Every structure is written in structure tokens, then in C-alpha cells.
């Protein structure tokens, strides 16, 4: 239940002092804001600790290195799949709102 606006704004016929002082008018706009914008560091830390304790000899850290590499590959795959899937959208939402726009005036 949206908060009431009865008697909240400084208006004539409103005895009490204003409750809200909206910087912008409280009128629904016909658009929505544009969607607003490290990975796999555990495996990296494991591999780097193994390197530190083994003098970075990859010979004795093969499992950790392979896990790190596969994790990076999966991170790339996740980025790609996420991008394609992301491609409701603000564009669609704005189109719908345009179809049914706000009317803050009299026709």
C-alpha cells in the first residue's frame, strides 16, 4: 500500500507544515531508469599458496593449476551465456509505458 500523499505536501488548505518536500514533482514519468551495471579467486588463492609453498614449481601443483585454468574457462563461459541471456528489459518496459503513458494534464 503506497504511502499516503493526503496532506503531505505544502499546499493551500493544508494546515500542517509540509511532511515531504519532493525536489521533483511526484508524477510518474513515461520511462524507467536504464539498467545499472572479481570471479573465481578461491581457486587462484589455492594455486598461489601451493606455488608459494612449492617454489612455484608447476610440477608439484598440477591439480591446482588445472583447476584454476578450468575455473577461468568456466568464468568466460558464464560471461558469454549471461550476456546472451541478458540481451523485463528497460526498452520493452518503456515501450509498454509509451503505449499507456501518464496524463498529468487534462485532455
Amino acid at each position: 500500500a503506497t504511502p499516503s500523499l493526503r496532506g503531505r505536501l505544502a499546499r493551500f488548505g493544508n494546515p500542517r507544515k509540509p511532511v515531504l518536500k519532493p525536489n521533483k514533482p511526484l508524477i510518474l514519468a513515461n520511462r524507467v531508469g536504464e539498467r545499472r551495471r572479481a570471479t573465481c579467486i578461491t581457486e587462484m588463492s589455492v594455486m598461489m599458496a601451493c606455488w608459494k609453498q612449492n617454489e612455484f614449481r608447476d610440477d608439484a601443483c598440477r591439480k591446482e593449476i588445472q583447476g584454476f585454468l578450468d575455473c577461468a574457462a568456466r568464468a568466460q563461459e558464464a560471461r558469454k551465456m549471461r550476456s546472451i541471456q541478458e540481451t523485463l528489459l528497460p526498452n520493452k518496459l518503456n515501450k509498454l509505458l509509451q503505449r499507456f503513458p501518464n496524463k498529468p494534464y487534462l485532455s
Binding site: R99, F100, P101, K103, S107
Partner: protein, 76 residues
């Protein structure tokens, strides 16, 4: 009303151009500038069909009466 629930600009333009306007106005329409409003339901298929049939029949009747009267006058 246009497709955004505003008065059709043709109403205002026709009023500007002095073209008489008949028009079905629903309860949310503005009959201020329509020459001949016909307050009624324009959103129901049955109502719209009825209006189309009425106007079509009246126009056809008028044209056929015009033809008959022209023949009557020119044959005497």
C-alpha cells in the same frame, strides 16, 4: 480517441477546417468540438457493428433516394 486515450487530432483539424463531424463519443471522450456527438459505447464489437451498419444503410438510402429523385426530375 486515438490509441493513447487522447482526442483524435482529426477532430481539432476538422473543426479548424469547418468540416462537420459526426462522432460516437464514449464516456471518456470530449464532445466539445464534435458537431454531432452520439453518446454511446464505441468499444464493444456489437455497438461498433451497429454503428457501421446504421451509417452504411443511411448513406446507401440517401444515395439511392438521390438517384431516384434525379430520375424523377429529369424524366418530366
Amino acid at each position: 480517441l486515438n490509441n493513447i486515450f487522447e482526442p483524435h487530432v482529426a477532430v481539432r483539424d476538422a473543426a479548424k477546417m469547418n468540416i462537420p463531424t459526426v462522432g460516437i463519443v464514449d464516456t471518456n471522450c470530449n464532445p466539445c468540438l464534435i458537431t454531432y456527438p452520439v453518446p454511446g459505447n464505441d468499444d464493444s464489437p456489437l455497438a461498433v457493428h451497429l454503428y457501421c451498419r446504421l451509417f452504411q444503410t443511411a448513406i446507401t438510402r440517401a444515395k439511392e433516394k438521390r438517384q431516384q429523385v434525379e430520375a424523377l426530375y429529369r424524366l418530366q
